């Protein structure tokens, strides 16, 4: 229904790493030098441009935010949203009679149902749908890999900043202004890199893949329902395949009625 | 991708100077040679010609050779299948010509005379596989160079540090020499994660993009030699574009 | 041959031979023991003799194989099929052991007998598999030594750090331990990514070239048995030839 | 094979003892126990008893139980072929014995029985695969312990550094404390790459060698099952040996 683990996890990780700053004097502005911000964040972002052209690096907050939003209600409702269609198309008319499949929810069900009203061989439908899922999973893998690659570049430039801070520190041996603000750069570059990489990017990079998996299973059960409608089956026999996709606790979650 | 280099260097140069320090200490010309020459030397040891000369033909395709794919492939194939449907049958080369990118023509010139789906499929898979291998090898070479760059930067750091214990007096120099001796690994790691590792991943990303495009082209050509029409073939082909391109294509 | 081993060590020497005109300080006898002795000894632990003895009979047997280029083999197959055709018969042949180095003889000395070709394919492709596996094992040995070298450089780094520590009361033991820590890892770095990891990866590309050459010889020896003319055999054999050499061979 | 273990410690110990200081500082009974007991404990967490106890009963096979193969498998197969073919029959059990070492008879007792070449192939290949898997398991168990050793060495290093800081007088204890702290990670790193990872790769290499040997057996067991010309069989058998051995066997 509502993936509640990532919103609580983000606030937990960041609240802890933020209370860490304000527990030794409470001053929070000493963890912000503008140089280290450039070296780490701008460095990794520019290497991300070198890697990804601005055209499909623009799909960052598109095929990442479409997953992170996930406002689609198609979680368990798919079952009854298919049994009612089968009931209204079976003994309540004929298959070439749209109920709401030109105004219903997220496009995949819409797409398949627009396909099943017009005469199409089931093999063709199966191939297009599987080929429509695999490409979805490939776009999700591309986005997740884009995230993990940035998670990799961030501590790389953390190391680079550590080297900058050591070079410009050893260079000016005693100035009372380069020992500090030269060690500050070395430390804060590493801090931003090692915080960014495994708090924002590597977790959320790995997170995109499980959302891709659950959406793939959802699309698989949707495909099975569409082929069931195309073949023509009673809702009684329909459940023998659709219910065998959820989790065992999720199985009984709806069978109360 | 050519904007990214000047940006990744300008941002780190701004970071190296925002303290107000003199960037004069981040420059010695010998260390540039140690790092880059050693990396490219070990690269010559590592990789032979006929395979070092194929890194260039692909690193000269990520900056150039811009096609028209991912929105025009669908248009082209839907209009051919409209032609292949009872008006302009499979023996019509008028539309196949003038559309030669490198690949769509390769299959559209071989579908017209005679082939079997289980043969065009195989030769197309082999072509995509060799194209994937070319990019994989170029990316592996660039990643290996990003590996030998900080390795030889470390080597140069050690070269600069070893000749410092001999002249071990005590004033300011045990620090100045550690400074000017650490520049070599700085250049090493900086080149590694600013030029080579990003470009190494760039080759892999472009290989994925071109694999998706060539699979779209393959599916299209296989759909031409099937006797299919739009609203089925279009539905099939369209299931490769990002959902952004599905709304930016449905409006056209 | 682009193996620029002279270049990396030349750049190191040019780095080593800086203002400290005496490079006798880049030689610590203890550091040699730790790094090289420990690496070689863990190589004996890993690879026992009669196997580690092959460090100079594959690694050395591949770096002097410039006695037969992949065009010479085409011309040899050409003029052997010349006398295998109408002019002469496939009964008497002595050009096998005329100016061939080690291979193409086992295939020829076998096909001149009256046996089936299927087993010939089965044995020759088997030889190619075993040869690639042998080269893979040699290159894996070279990479494993490049893995143990910097590991023992780190070991020596810890050794020199501990030995320098707790007795910072003079200028003899601290100097010895400092030099140990520095040059122990200097040897390991200068060794791994300049002699072993380059040459570990390099030995696999020689293996690929020899594998392609051997598949070519295999196709040739199978064409000798069958009744094919060199004209119609050339195109069946030239398929494995290098792309840039196809035009370079057509000069004839 | 154990001759390398004494060398891999004596060489580094000489390097540790290059007239710098007593090795009494390099030894601390606390840190030894932290490192080794911690790695052993994490190994007990990883592998339980009756499965970590099976380690030593496979690793001891690497120190003994040598093989006669690579020169003698070929001879003991060609003479068996010459004795079965042309003489009596393949069911000659009189001479099939007297050389029952480990594995040749595993299939030779079956070819004299009524089977098909596929089922014997499947039993032999299954045996080879499970041998490789058991060796992979042992090698994994050794590399994993080589990984835990320096991890717990660093754990002990951190322990020593914590209880050194805020526990000292800040005058001269900083150095000696760091020495006796890093002793732990020295022990961990040394034990890892001197004992375990070399032994893990030794298990892997031995699995490779015995796998080639068992494939060499099976290819030839199937030949005896078919009763083929010993010439062809001598040729396919010898096509497994290093070029020095392909000749060294030739004069025998």
């Amino acid at each position: 229904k509502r993936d509640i683990l990532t919103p609580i996890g983000f606030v937990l990780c960041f609240g802890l790493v933020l209370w860490g700053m304000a527990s030794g004097g409470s001053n929070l502005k000493v963890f912000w030098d503008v140089a280290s911000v450039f070296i780490t964040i701008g460095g990794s972002m520019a290497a991300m441009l070198i890697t990804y052209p601005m055209d499909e690096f623009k799909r960052l907050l598109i095929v990442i935010r479409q997953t992170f939003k996930d406002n689609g209600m198609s979680n368990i409702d798919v079952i009854q949203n298919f049994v009612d269609l089968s009931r209204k198309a079976r003994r309540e008319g004929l298959l070439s009679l749209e109920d709401a499949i030109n105004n219903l929810t997220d496009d995949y069900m819409k797409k398949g149902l627009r396909m099943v009203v017009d005469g199409i061989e089931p093999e063709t439908i199966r191939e297009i749908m599987e080929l429509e899922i695999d490409e979805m999973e490939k776009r999700h893998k591309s986005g997740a890999d884009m995230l993990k690659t940035w998670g990799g570049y961030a501590p790389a430039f953390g190391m680079v900043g550590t080297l900058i801070g050591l070079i410009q520190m050893l260079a000016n041996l005693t100035d009372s202004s380069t020992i500090a603000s030269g060690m500050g750069k070395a430390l804060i570059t590493t801090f931003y890199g090692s915080l960014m990489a495994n708090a924002v990017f590597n977790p959320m990079g790995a997170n995109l893949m499980f959302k891709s998996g659950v959406e793939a299973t959802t699309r698989e059960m949707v495909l099975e329902g569409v082929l069931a409608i195309q073949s023509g089956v009673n809702p009684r026999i329909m459940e023998e395949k659709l219910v065998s996709y959820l989790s065992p606790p999720e199985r009984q979650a709806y069978s109360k009625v | 991708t050519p904007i990214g280099f000047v940006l990744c260097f300008g941002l780190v140069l701004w970071g190296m100077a925002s303290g107000g320090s003199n960037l004069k200490v981040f420059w010695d010309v010998a260390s540039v040679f140690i790092t880059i020459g050693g990396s490219m030397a070990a690269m010559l040891i590592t990789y032979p010609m006929d395979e070092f000369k194929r890194l260039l033909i692909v690193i000269r395709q990520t900056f150039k050779d811009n096609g028209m794919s991912n929105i025009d492939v669908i248009q082209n194939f839907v209009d051919l299948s409209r032609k292949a449907r009872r008006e302009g049958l499979l023996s019509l080369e008028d539309a196949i010509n003038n559309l030669t990118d490198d690949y769509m023509k390769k299959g559209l010139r071989m579908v017209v005379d005679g082939i079997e789906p289980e043969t065009i499929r195989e030769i197309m898979e082999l072509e995509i596989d060799e194209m994937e291998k070319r990019h994989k090898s170029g990316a592996d070479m660039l990643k290996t160079w990003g590996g030998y760059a900080p390795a030889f930067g470390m080597v140069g750091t050690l070269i600069g540090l070893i000749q410092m214990l001999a002249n071990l007096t005590d004033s300011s120099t045990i620090a100045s020499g550690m400074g000017k001796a650490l520049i070599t690994t700085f250049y090493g790691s900086l080149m590694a994660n600013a030029v080579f590792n990003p470009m190494g991943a760039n080759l892999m990303f472009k290989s994925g993009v071109e694999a998706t495009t060539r699979e779209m082209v393959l599916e299209g050509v296989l759909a031409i030699q099937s006797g299919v029409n739009p609203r089925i073939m279009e539905e099939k082909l369209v299931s490769y574009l990002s959902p952004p391109e599905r709304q930016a294509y449905s409006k056209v | 041959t682009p193996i620029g081993f002279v270049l990396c060590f030349g750049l190191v020497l040019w780095g080593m031979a800086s203002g400290g005109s005496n490079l006798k300080v880049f030689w610590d006898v203890a550091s040699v023991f730790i790094t090289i002795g420990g690496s070689m000894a863990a190589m004996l632990i890993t690879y026992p003799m009669d196997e580690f003895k092959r460090l100079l009979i594959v690694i050395r047997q591949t770096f002097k194989d410039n006695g037969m280029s992949n065009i010479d083999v085409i011309q040899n197959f050409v003029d052997l099929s010349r006398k295998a055709r109408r002019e002469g018969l496939l009964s008497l042949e002595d050009a096998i052991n005329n100016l061939t180095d080690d291979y193409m003889k086992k295939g020829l000395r076998m096909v001149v007998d009256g046996i089936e070709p299927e087993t010939i394919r089965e044995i020759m492709e088997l030889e190619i598999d075993e040869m690639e596996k042998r080269h893979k094992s040699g290159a894996d040995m070279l990479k494993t030594w490049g893995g143990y070298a910097p590991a023992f450089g780190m070991v020596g780094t810890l050794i020199g750090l501990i030995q320098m520590l707790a007795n910072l009361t003079d200028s003899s033991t601290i100097a010895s331990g400092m030099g140990k820590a520095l040059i122990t890892t200097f040897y390991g770095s200068l060794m791994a990514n300049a002699v072993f990891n380059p040459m570990g990866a390099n030995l696999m590309f020689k293996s690929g070239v020899e594998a392609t050459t051997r598949e070519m010889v295999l196709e040739g020896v199978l064409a000798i048995q069958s009744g094919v003319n060199p004209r119609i055999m050339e195109e069946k054999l030239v398929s494995y030839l290098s792309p840039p050499e196809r035009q370079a061979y057509s000069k004839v | 094979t154990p001759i390398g273990f004494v060398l891999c410690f004596g060489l580094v110990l000489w390097g540790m003892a290059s007239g710098g200081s007593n090795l009494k500082v390099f030894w601390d009974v606390a840190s030894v126990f932290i490192t080794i007991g911690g790695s052993m404990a994490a190994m007990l967490i990883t592998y339980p008893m009756d499965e970590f106890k099976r380690l030593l009963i496979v690793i001891r096979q690497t120190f003994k139980d040598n093989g006669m193969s690579n020169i003698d498998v070929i001879q003991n197969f060609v003479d068996l072929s010459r004795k079965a073919r042309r003489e009596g029959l393949l069911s000659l059990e009189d001479a099939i014995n007297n050389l029952t070492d480990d594995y040749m008879k595993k299939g030779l007792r079956m070819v004299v029985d009524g089977i098909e070449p596929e089922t014997i192939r499947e039993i032999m290949e299954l045996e080879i695969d499970e041998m490789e898997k058991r060796h992979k398991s042992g090698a994994d168990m050794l590399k994993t312990w080589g990984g835990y050793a320096p991890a717990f060495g660093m754990v002990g290093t951190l322990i020593g550094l914590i209880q050194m800081l805020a526990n000292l007088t800040d005058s001269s204890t900083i150095a000696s404390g760091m020495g006796k702290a890093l002793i732990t990670t020295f022990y961990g790193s040394l034990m890892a790459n001197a004992v375990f990872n070399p032994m893990g790769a030794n298990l892997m290499f031995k699995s490779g060698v015995e796998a080639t040997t068992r494939e060499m057996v099976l290819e030839g067991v199937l030949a005896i099952q078919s009763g083929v010309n010993p010439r062809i069989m001598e040729e396919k058998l010898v096509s497994y040996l290093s070029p020095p051995e392909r000749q060294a066997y030739s004069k025998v």
Partner: peptide, 29 residues
Amino acid sequence: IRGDEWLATFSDTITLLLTFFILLYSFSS
């Protein structure tokens, strides 16, 4: 490669900088 494999010799040379700083620490001046 993995883009991280020099972190071994990186740690080596960082340890060596630490050793030089130890060398700057037997006298502190």
